[PDB]
Structures are given as C-alpha cells and as structure tokens.
Nucleic acid binder design. Sequence first.
RNA 1: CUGACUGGGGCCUGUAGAGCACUGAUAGGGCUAGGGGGCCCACCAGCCUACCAAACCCUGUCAAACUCCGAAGGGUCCCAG
RNA 2: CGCCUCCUAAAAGGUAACGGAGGCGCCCAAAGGUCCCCUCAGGCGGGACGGAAAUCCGCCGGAGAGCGCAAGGGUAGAAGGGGGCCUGACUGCGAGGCCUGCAAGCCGAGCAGGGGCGAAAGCCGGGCCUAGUGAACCGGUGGUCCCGUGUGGAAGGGCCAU
RNA 3: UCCCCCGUGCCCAUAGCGGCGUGGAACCACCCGUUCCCAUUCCGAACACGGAAGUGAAACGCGCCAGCGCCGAUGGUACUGGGCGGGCGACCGCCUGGGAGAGUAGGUCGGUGCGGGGGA
Lengths: 181, 110, 69, 141, 77, 53
Amino acid sequence: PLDVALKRKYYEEVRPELIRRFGYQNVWEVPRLEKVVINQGLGEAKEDARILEKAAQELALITGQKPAVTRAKKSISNFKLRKGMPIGLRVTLRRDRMWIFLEKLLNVALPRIRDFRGLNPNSFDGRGNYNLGLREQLIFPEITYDMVDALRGMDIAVVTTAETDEEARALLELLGFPFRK
Amino acid sequence: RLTAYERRKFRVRNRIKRTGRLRLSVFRSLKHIYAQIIDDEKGVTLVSASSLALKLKGNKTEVARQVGRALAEKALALGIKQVAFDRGPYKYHGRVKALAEGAREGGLEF
Amino acid sequence: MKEGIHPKLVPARIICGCGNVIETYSTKPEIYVEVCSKCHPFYTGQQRFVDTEGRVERFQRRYGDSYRK
Amino acid sequence: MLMPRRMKYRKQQRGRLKGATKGGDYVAFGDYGLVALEPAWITAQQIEAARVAMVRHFRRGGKIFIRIFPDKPYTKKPLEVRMGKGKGNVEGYVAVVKPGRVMFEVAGVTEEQAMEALRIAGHKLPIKTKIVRRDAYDEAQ
Amino acid sequence: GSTRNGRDSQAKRLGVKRYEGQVVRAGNILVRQRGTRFKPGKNVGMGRDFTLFALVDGVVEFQDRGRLGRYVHVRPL
Amino acid sequence: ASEVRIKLLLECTECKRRNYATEKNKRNTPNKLELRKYCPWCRKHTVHREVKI
RNA sequence: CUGACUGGGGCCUGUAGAGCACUGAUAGGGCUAGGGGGCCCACCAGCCUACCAAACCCUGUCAAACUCCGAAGGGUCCCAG
RNA sequence: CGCCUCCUAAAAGGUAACGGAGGCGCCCAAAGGUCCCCUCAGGCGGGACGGAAAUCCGCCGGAGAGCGCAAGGGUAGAAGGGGGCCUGACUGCGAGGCCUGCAAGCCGAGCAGGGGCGAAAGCCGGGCCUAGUGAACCGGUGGUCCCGUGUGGAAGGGCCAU
RNA sequence: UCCCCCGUGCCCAUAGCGGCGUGGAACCACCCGUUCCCAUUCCGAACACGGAAGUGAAACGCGCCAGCGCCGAUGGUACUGGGCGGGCGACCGCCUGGGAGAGUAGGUCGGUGCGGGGGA
Ligand SMILES: [Mg+2]
Ligand SMILES: [Mg+2]
Ligand SMILES: [Mg+2]
Ligand SMILES: [Mg+2]
Ligand SMILES: [Mg+2]
Ligand SMILES: [Mg+2]
Ligand SMILES: [Mg+2]
Ligand SMILES: [Mg+2]
Ligand SMILES: [Mg+2]
Ligand SMILES: [Mg+2]
Ligand SMILES: [Mg+2]
Ligand SMILES: [Mg+2]
Ligand SMILES: [Mg+2]
Ligand SMILES: [Mg+2]
Ligand SMILES: [Mg+2]
Ligand SMILES: [Mg+2]
Ligand SMILES: [Mg+2]
Ligand SMILES: [Mg+2]
Ligand SMILES: [Mg+2]
Ligand SMILES: [Mg+2]
Ligand SMILES: [Mg+2]
Ligand SMILES: [Mg+2]
Ligand SMILES: [Mg+2]
Ligand SMILES: [Mg+2]
Ligand SMILES: [Mg+2]
Ligand SMILES: [Mg+2]
Ligand SMILES: [Mg+2]
Ligand SMILES: [Mg+2]
Ligand SMILES: [Mg+2]
Ligand SMILES: [Mg+2]
Ligand SMILES: [Mg+2]
Ligand SMILES: [Mg+2]
Ligand SMILES: [Mg+2]
Ligand SMILES: [Mg+2]
Ligand SMILES: [Mg+2]
Ligand SMILES: [Mg+2]
Ligand SMILES: [Mg+2]
Ligand SMILES: [Mg+2]
Ligand SMILES: [Mg+2]
Ligand SMILES: [Mg+2]
Ligand SMILES: [Mg+2]
Ligand SMILES: [Mg+2]
Ligand SMILES: [Mg+2]
Ligand SMILES: [Mg+2]
Ligand SMILES: [Mg+2]
Ligand SMILES: [Mg+2]
Ligand SMILES: [Mg+2]
Ligand SMILES: [Mg+2]
Ligand SMILES: [Mg+2]
Ligand SMILES: [Mg+2]
Ligand SMILES: [Mg+2]
Ligand SMILES: [Mg+2]
Ligand SMILES: [Mg+2]
Ligand SMILES: [Mg+2]
Ligand SMILES: [Mg+2]
Ligand SMILES: [Mg+2]
Ligand SMILES: [Mg+2]
Ligand SMILES: [Mg+2]
Ligand SMILES: [Mg+2]
Ligand SMILES: [Mg+2]
Ligand SMILES: [Mg+2]
Ligand SMILES: [Mg+2]
Ligand SMILES: [Mg+2]
Ligand SMILES: [Mg+2]
Ligand SMILES: [Mg+2]
Ligand SMILES: [Mg+2]
Ligand SMILES: [Mg+2]
Ligand SMILES: [Mg+2]
Ligand SMILES: [Mg+2]
Ligand SMILES: [Mg+2]
Ligand SMILES: [Mg+2]
Ligand SMILES: [Mg+2]
Ligand SMILES: [Mg+2]
Ligand SMILES: [Mg+2]
Ligand SMILES: [Mg+2]
Ligand SMILES: [Mg+2]
Ligand SMILES: [Mg+2]
Ligand SMILES: [Mg+2]
Ligand SMILES: [Mg+2]
Ligand SMILES: [Mg+2]
Ligand SMILES: [Mg+2]
Ligand SMILES: [Mg+2]
Ligand SMILES: [Mg+2]
Ligand SMILES: [Mg+2]
Ligand SMILES: [Mg+2]
Ligand SMILES: [Mg+2]
Ligand SMILES: [Mg+2]
Ligand SMILES: [Mg+2]
Ligand SMILES: [Mg+2]
Ligand SMILES: [Mg+2]
Ligand SMILES: [Mg+2]
Ligand SMILES: [Mg+2]
Ligand SMILES: [Mg+2]
Ligand SMILES: [Mg+2]
Ligand SMILES: [Mg+2]
Ligand SMILES: [Mg+2]
Ligand SMILES: [Mg+2]
Ligand SMILES: [Mg+2]
Ligand SMILES: [Zn+2]
Ligand SMILES: [Zn+2]
C-alpha cells in the first residue's frame, strides 16, 4: 500500500478526533470510507457520436482507473432510448485509488470549481453517505482545456461505514470536505 | 431474502443430489478445510476429514490435498468408491480443487 | 487490476499559483494549477477578496449632515 | 345514478338468489335501517328513487347511507329479435340483495323522521322491508 | 346482430394419471400438467412439457414439502 | 417459414449428401450455414453446408 | 369371481359456502400528492376551502373468466363383501 | 367453419348453445446445448446537465418484474440476466405410457454410433409449457444402386431424404 | 449421556420482521496483504490465493420481548352426500350423516437427525 497524505491524515488526525467527538467503544465502530463511486450519466452519447471512448479516457486519467459502461434497463420514448444503449460510465474507486482521488478532489478540483462557495450541507443520505455533482471535468488537474472536446459533468458517491448523517458529516468534514453551511 | 452465496450454494447442491450419489461436501474457512461424504437418502455422514482434526500444518493448498488423501483413505476402508463433488459455494479451483485432486489420488471415484 | 486497460499511477507534484506544492499521485508526474485549498478565498478563513465593503450602502451614504434642524 | 366506473367484464351471467345475505346484516353507520325481507335484483333507478325520497323527507338535514351497490350488469335483447345471435345489451345495473341485508341507513334525524323516510323509501323498492333501529347486537358485530 | 365470440380450444386432459399407492412401470406417465405443479421426486423424470413419469418399476408416492412444492416419487418394489 | 425465413438442407461436405433439413432467416443470417453434423454415410461428424432446398 | 353396489385405507380436486391476501369493482370516513375555486400576488412564495379527487388507512361490501381459504361429494388404486 | 388460452364446466376426465372474453397461421443461428457467474419490480433518501421515468449511491423490498407474441399454468433453490466453449435444432433405434371410434397427436427411460460442454456428478435427440397447421393422390430435386419385359445397357420405376 | 461451536440435512413461518442483549479461549467471520493460482463488462466489493497484528464494529451463533407477521381452538353457523316436505314462483323448511370460512379464546421470537471440533 501507498503512503498517501490524506490516507494518513485519516488515521492520524481524523480517527482520534472522531473517537473523542462521539466516544466509540470499538475500533471498527469508527467511521471508515468504503468506496467512492463516480458516475457519468451522459447519454449525450445515445446515438450521436456514441464514441464516448473520449470520456472513458478522461475518467481513466482522473481516477487512474478505466470506467465500465452502463446501459439502459428499459426502452424510453421521450429521451430517444432503446434498451441496451450505452448511456453512462461508472468507475468504482476503492482503497488507495479512492484516497488519491479524494485527495486531489479536495485539494485542487473543488477549488477550481467556478464560484465555488462550499459543498452542500444537505446532500447527505440519512444513512450517512454523501453525493455531489460536478458540471465539468476541467475541475481535475489531469484534464486541460487543450484536450477536451465538450463539457461533461459527473455524480460522485462517497460511501461511509457511518450509520448516521451526523457522524458521516464529522468524518468528511474532518478529512477536509468544505461545507458551505 | 437470500444472498448470492446462499443461492450459488443451493444451485450446485441441488444438481448434485439429483444424481443420487454419496456427496463429498467441502467447507472452506479462512484457516481450515473440512470434508463430509454424506448420504442424503439417509441424512447421514459416512466419513470425515478435516485440517482441523488432522492438526495439519501450513500452506493451505498443500494442506487441502492432504485432507483430500486422508478422506479417501478412511473412505475406501469403508467400501465407498464412487461419490459426487460438492463444491458448495466454492469455484472448483484453489484449495477445493486441491482437496478434490487429493481424494482422487486417494482412489475416490469421481 | 486487469492488465493493459488502466493508466499507470505514479508519484506526482501538483503546483499551485500560491506557490504551494502537493505530493500526491497521478497519471501525470508534474501538474501546474491556478488555485488550491491553500489560497482559495472560501478556504482561506474568509478572505473577503475584493469586496470588504460592509455593504457599504445605503444608510451608510453620508454626504452629509448639512440639511438643517 | 349508481354504476361501476369500470369493469373487467361487460356482461355477467345471471347466477342465483338462494340464501340469506352474506354479510351486510347489521347496522353499521347510522341509527335506523332498512332491511330486505325478500331477494331481488335492486335496480340502480330503484336505489336512486329510494334515496331521493329520503332526502326529500329530510328537506335539509340527516345523512343517508347507501349500503347496496349495483355492480351487476343487466342485459336485454332488442325488441322483437328472435333467440340466438349473441347475448343482449346491457340496459342497466342491479344490486343483488338477499334477505337480511341492510340496504339503507339514516342518521342525524329524529326517530319519527327516520321511520317515515325509510317507509317511503320502502315503497320504492320492489321487495318487502322492515325498519330496524340500532341495537347492541349491531354494536357487537 | 352476430357474435365476435364463439371459439374455444380442445380440452387437454391434464392432471394426475396415477395416484399414491398405485403400482407403475418404468415409463408410466404419472402427471400431465402445465409447468411444475408437481416436481419430479425420487425416480421420476420430467419431459419437456413437464410431464412426470416413472423411471423404475415401483409404487407411486406423493409428498408435500411445503414451500418446496409437491413431489411425485416412485418407490422401488 | 416465410419469404424471409426459408427452409434449407445441410449437405455433408465430405460425401456431398444432404443429411438434414432445417430453416434459417436469410435477412438475419445471409451467409450460408456451416454446422458440424453427424453424417450417417461417413459415420462421423462433418462440416455440413447450407445448400438449396 | 374378476361385475354393479358396498366397507376400510391412501392419493387427486378448487365447486357450495366463505373470504378480500391477489385482479378488479365499491359506500362512507381519515389521512394526503394532484387538480377546481376563493384570499393575496406577479418579486415568487403564501394562506383559506362544506369543490372534484390519486396512493395509503379504517369501517362496510361485490365478482363466471378474483381466491388467503374451502367443504359435502366426486374420481382412482389397494384389501375385503 | 381449422388451431390455442380462460370462463361457462356442477372441486377427477369429458361436456352444448349464432353463450361470455381473447389469441394463432409466426419466430429465434440464438431466442438452441453445456459450464460458470449474476437477481427483480417497486417505494423512500441522496446525486451536474437530467425531467414521473435515462445512468450512479444508500436503505427497505419473496416476487407484484422478467420469461419474443393471447391467456393460463409455471418459475429467482430459475424457466429470468451476463459471459466462455460449442451445433444433441444428432444418426440408428426405442422399454413403457398419456390421449383416443379411426387416423392422428403427445411424453419418453435406456442401448449403439459419432460428438458438445463440464474437474466431475452429469447434462444435451431444439426453444418454461400449452397455438404457429394439412391425410392421401399426382409431380419436382438430392441420394441409393433395388427392379430393368430374350440378353447387355438405356427408358421408366422402387427405396431413403426433401 | 450434557454444554458451546462448525458442517450438512429434515419438518416448511409456532421457524419470519423488528427492538434489546450477549459471544471470540475454541470455531466462524470480519481482518492483514495481492508475490503466486485465480478474478473485476471498472473495482482483491465478489471470486481467488498467501497470511495471523487486531476486532467481534459488520456478519453469524445463542438469548430475551408479542408491535407487525405466522399459527389457531372450542362453541355456533353457512354449505352439503342421502332421505322428506312446502311454495304459482323468486325461493323455503324437516330428518340423517358430513361440516366450513370469518371471528373469539389462545399460541409462537422454532423443533429435530447425522458427522466433526472443543468443554465438563
Ligand atoms: Mg440530508
Ligand atoms: Mg453509511
Ligand atoms: Mg484542469
Ligand atoms: Mg341464465
Ligand atoms: Mg329486473
Ligand atoms: Mg337479463
Ligand atoms: Mg338469445
Ligand atoms: Mg340478454
Ligand atoms: Mg334496468
Ligand atoms: Mg345482499
Ligand atoms: Mg315496497
Ligand atoms: Mg365482519
Ligand atoms: Mg361477428
Ligand atoms: Mg364462445
Ligand atoms: Mg375437447
Ligand atoms: Mg369444447
Ligand atoms: Mg379448454
Ligand atoms: Mg391433478
Ligand atoms: Mg427433457
Ligand atoms: Mg423445453
Ligand atoms: Mg404418505
Ligand atoms: Mg419414497
Ligand atoms: Mg431434422
Ligand atoms: Mg368374489
Ligand atoms: Mg376391480
Ligand atoms: Mg370395482
Ligand atoms: Mg368404496
Ligand atoms: Mg358463491
Ligand atoms: Mg379485493
Ligand atoms: Mg380485514
Ligand atoms: Mg355470488
Ligand atoms: Mg369459476
Ligand atoms: Mg368462484
Ligand atoms: Mg368414493
Ligand atoms: Mg377413495
Ligand atoms: Mg372380492
Ligand atoms: Mg388448421
Ligand atoms: Mg372444466
Ligand atoms: Mg374448471
Ligand atoms: Mg373438470
Ligand atoms: Mg364434477
Ligand atoms: Mg380419460
Ligand atoms: Mg379471430
Ligand atoms: Mg449469448
Ligand atoms: Mg432459453
Ligand atoms: Mg450460452
Ligand atoms: Mg431501485
Ligand atoms: Mg431519486
Ligand atoms: Mg437536477
Ligand atoms: Mg432520477
Ligand atoms: Mg409476472
Ligand atoms: Mg401480443
Ligand atoms: Mg473444441
Ligand atoms: Mg409402443
Ligand atoms: Mg393410438
Ligand atoms: Mg458424451
Ligand atoms: Mg454417447
Ligand atoms: Mg474434457
Ligand atoms: Mg435422451
Ligand atoms: Mg424461448
Ligand atoms: Mg414455441
Ligand atoms: Mg384422387
Ligand atoms: Mg381426392
Ligand atoms: Mg410418386
Ligand atoms: Mg432388357
Ligand atoms: Mg441390375
Ligand atoms: Mg425388349
Ligand atoms: Mg455392350
Ligand atoms: Mg445385368
Ligand atoms: Mg452409362
Ligand atoms: Mg434411373
Ligand atoms: Mg432412381
Ligand atoms: Mg420415404
Ligand atoms: Mg432414415
Ligand atoms: Mg450450524
Ligand atoms: Mg441442525
Ligand atoms: Mg432425517
Ligand atoms: Mg459485545
Ligand atoms: Mg445479534
Ligand atoms: Mg479470536
Ligand atoms: Mg481476546
Ligand atoms: Mg496477518
Ligand atoms: Mg500481480
Ligand atoms: Mg510465490
Ligand atoms: Mg480483499
Ligand atoms: Mg456484533
Ligand atoms: Mg458466510
Ligand atoms: Mg413467552
Ligand atoms: Mg380462524
Ligand atoms: Mg366447529
Ligand atoms: Mg344437515
Ligand atoms: Mg337433497
Ligand atoms: Mg350434522
Ligand atoms: Mg367451507
Ligand atoms: Mg375455523
Ligand atoms: Mg416469532
Ligand atoms: Mg450433533
Ligand atoms: Mg460432540
Ligand atoms: Zn494555491
Ligand atoms: Zn458424408
């Protein structure tokens, strides 16, 4: 395993502060990150230039991992959707890669968001997971202007072993997720 | 509400029972590996073999193969030759494959 | 991981405009960014960038008191 | 007047009218009741006539509860055709009613008023009826 | 005036053909059915149309295993 | 069977005898069928080819 | 001697009845998306409704092509008269 | 006007009417065999474009989804969804039955030949099932090399397949 | 022969949902790793291998609680095989034998076989 700064920050600073703040009787009861699942709901590729090999590439640069395709469960009219059609990507970051991503997201990406005024305090699950949406992929340090054909966003799920919203807030906030209110 | 494990397990066991053989069932824990040869007509085990019971050693795979041979031995001595391999929820591979090859060398018929 | 489908992750330095340097990993060894957590307004306590006004308007006009009582 | 807003089937075989009411036998909402003494298909028009007469007795006041509903379609061949050539067309809907059923109940009105309304309503029904008032037996069902 | 109806299909003569306790021979059809109303049990085959039949000469036996469904067995003689 | 779903025979490629009749869709499956079949003449499986019925 | 019929025993069944768990129907009430309408507005949200009313819930019902149930009987095989 | 599904049909089977309702006259080279893996609809919550419904995350959710098409039965302990290898959508037969006036229709263990998948147990003689069909006569085509009008051929036929 | 656990069956919810509690010596899990066999339409999540620092947090096992779920009498009734009556009819009754469904009382937070491992 890699020494990656944020990972260590978790074990060194966040771990204990949490045990203080909520008083766990058990090493496993304390909140862990489980997985960060990034999704590009896309379908701007339904027919058109269904070469979103372009996006799979972009995501593979950002996460260091190649996404797998998602396809439509049922045929849908008004979106022009025949069943089986490639409409999305999903890359599931775990372990080291999950940390490396989150590191750069927190350090560099979110800063680079236009008029960024903090993440949303309310985007919390109620079973203690967080989700957040990006509008563009130029946010990440790996993707320059020069290399992009068209602006595309994404959904980020961050999945925690917390049982409650209130605990999961502490974990992500302590790790450094900037919340607006 | 069953799990992929509970299903997988049923699905293979169901096929094996259908053929009516004595079934060589295999349990594989994080540390050990056990083997009952069971008669399902009677709901009974006829011969056992475990890494736990053989106080066997180290490399899990090599160990498996050993319980494998062990099982066959007590088995032929009881007149059992033919039998059906119950890979449980386990891919026939690894420790299980190893156990299987061992009961084979051991002379078990399958 | 599956071979041949995944871009390599190597030690990588992200350099911000504040003059901050981040020791992290990427598919690119050296990256220059225009902003980061160390210098971003929202992050930097509450650095009220350009507009430290206190509104300023509109009671706070005050030119002047010279109308009489 | 009363009829199903929709049905799985347009025509129903006729069936039979043997036995006492299946249920619907005890007063269950208002104070006084009108129970069927003999079996019939009660027509939607007859139900509605019974109702209207009761509100007419009350003028303003009372609550009428209707406890039978015409979901049975009534079929009839056009005039003068001969037998065969398919089943008749639906001409109305009836509510099957076997002896014992509380068809109507009233509440919120004096006794002499509930009595008379149910009497007049009775005269609109093509069967014999008895007026009942709520007992403990009703309350215990 | 006329009818859009008027049709129906032949009866298929479905159902159990040999009841519990009845002596059968290998091949005897035991159950004729749509889908698996009875499942093949001990010494009982199922043909492509769900038809249950005796695999050996013997005696028929029924078995109701609750959520597991009902079963036709043939017990050797 | 239809104009598009046709009947066809399968001919053993070694001894040239037609051994099987079957059907295919010629819009979906325009190439001539090739299937390994048991040839009773040759007493062995043999690649058989679609040949016109 | 195997018969009709009968005794005992096993297995098969979905009707009478009944029920409402499914498919649908359904009166009223409760709760509550959605509309209608009235206050108050176009600065976009409010508020009130004895209006029509989805889903859900309670009370009370309906069904050949409904059934969570479910007989009496019936059928078949074995032994026996 | 034949065929399928439900009801009528009186709890075995069967059961009529110009009785009540619907379907068929196809299809699939995978939508077939086998090995391996996977599990639904829907509800609430969360999430850029993104909406009641596209894709993602969480919880609940036994089956109300799916199963090419009508209906019914069946079915996740898969018949549903994904992948790999494949052609058993076998050839020679066929114990024993279902059904049944006939003729038809249907199910089929097993043995042999030569195969497919599987480590094996084993499965595979098309398809979850029940419609998707047409006797005989006459003729076509491929095969066989059985008959060949004194004889050798040939004509023409038979036989197997279509 | 008794207690705990691990396998595997049988009865097919009186076994389930939920709330609470409890267990790590042993066993089981999670766990530590991903070189190696093997693997992800991406992901060592799964499957798989090699391990033994930790923890019973998750899962599982065992207890407890009747809010839901499930089971459910007795009594009476509906209906009915057979035998009789009545009504012009819709329909209604008697006898003998059978006898529900709803509901009420009540029950249930499983029982049991085989083999292992540990304990007394
Ligand atoms: Mg929230
Ligand atoms: Mg969580
Ligand atoms: Mg950039
Ligand atoms: Mg009639
Ligand atoms: Mg009338
Ligand atoms: Mg009529
Ligand atoms: Mg007529
Ligand atoms: Mg008529
Ligand atoms: Mg009328
Ligand atoms: Mg009535
Ligand atoms: Mg009158
Ligand atoms: Mg009641
Ligand atoms: Mg017509
Ligand atoms: Mg008809
Ligand atoms: Mg018929
Ligand atoms: Mg008929
Ligand atoms: Mg029929
Ligand atoms: Mg039957
Ligand atoms: Mg078969
Ligand atoms: Mg089939
Ligand atoms: Mg028995
Ligand atoms: Mg038996
Ligand atoms: Mg053929
Ligand atoms: Mg005699
Ligand atoms: Mg006899
Ligand atoms: Mg007899
Ligand atoms: Mg008898
Ligand atoms: Mg009835
Ligand atoms: Mg209902
Ligand atoms: Mg109820
Ligand atoms: Mg009725
Ligand atoms: Mg019926
Ligand atoms: Mg019925
Ligand atoms: Mg009898
Ligand atoms: Mg009997
Ligand atoms: Mg006798
Ligand atoms: Mg026809
Ligand atoms: Mg019938
Ligand atoms: Mg019937
Ligand atoms: Mg019948
Ligand atoms: Mg009958
Ligand atoms: Mg018959
Ligand atoms: Mg037609
Ligand atoms: Mg495929
Ligand atoms: Mg298939
Ligand atoms: Mg396949
Ligand atoms: Mg969902
Ligand atoms: Mg949502
Ligand atoms: Mg949005
Ligand atoms: Mg959405
Ligand atoms: Mg369905
Ligand atoms: Mg259709
Ligand atoms: Mg090959
Ligand atoms: Mg025969
Ligand atoms: Mg015949
Ligand atoms: Mg073979
Ligand atoms: Mg063979
Ligand atoms: Mg092989
Ligand atoms: Mg066969
Ligand atoms: Mg199919
Ligand atoms: Mg078919
Ligand atoms: Mg002729
Ligand atoms: Mg002729
Ligand atoms: Mg000819
Ligand atoms: Mg000659
Ligand atoms: Mg010659
Ligand atoms: Mg001559
Ligand atoms: Mg010559
Ligand atoms: Mg000659
Ligand atoms: Mg010549
Ligand atoms: Mg010739
Ligand atoms: Mg010739
Ligand atoms: Mg021929
Ligand atoms: Mg032949
Ligand atoms: Mg156990
Ligand atoms: Mg046990
Ligand atoms: Mg037993
Ligand atoms: Mg504890
Ligand atoms: Mg517990
Ligand atoms: Mg321990
Ligand atoms: Mg300890
Ligand atoms: Mg370790
Ligand atoms: Mg490697
Ligand atoms: Mg090595
Ligand atoms: Mg791992
Ligand atoms: Mg615990
Ligand atoms: Mg487990
Ligand atoms: Mg108690
Ligand atoms: Mg009860
Ligand atoms: Mg009783
Ligand atoms: Mg009686
Ligand atoms: Mg009688
Ligand atoms: Mg009696
Ligand atoms: Mg009953
Ligand atoms: Mg009862
Ligand atoms: Mg319980
Ligand atoms: Mg024991
Ligand atoms: Mg012991
Ligand atoms: Zn900076
Ligand atoms: Zn050949």
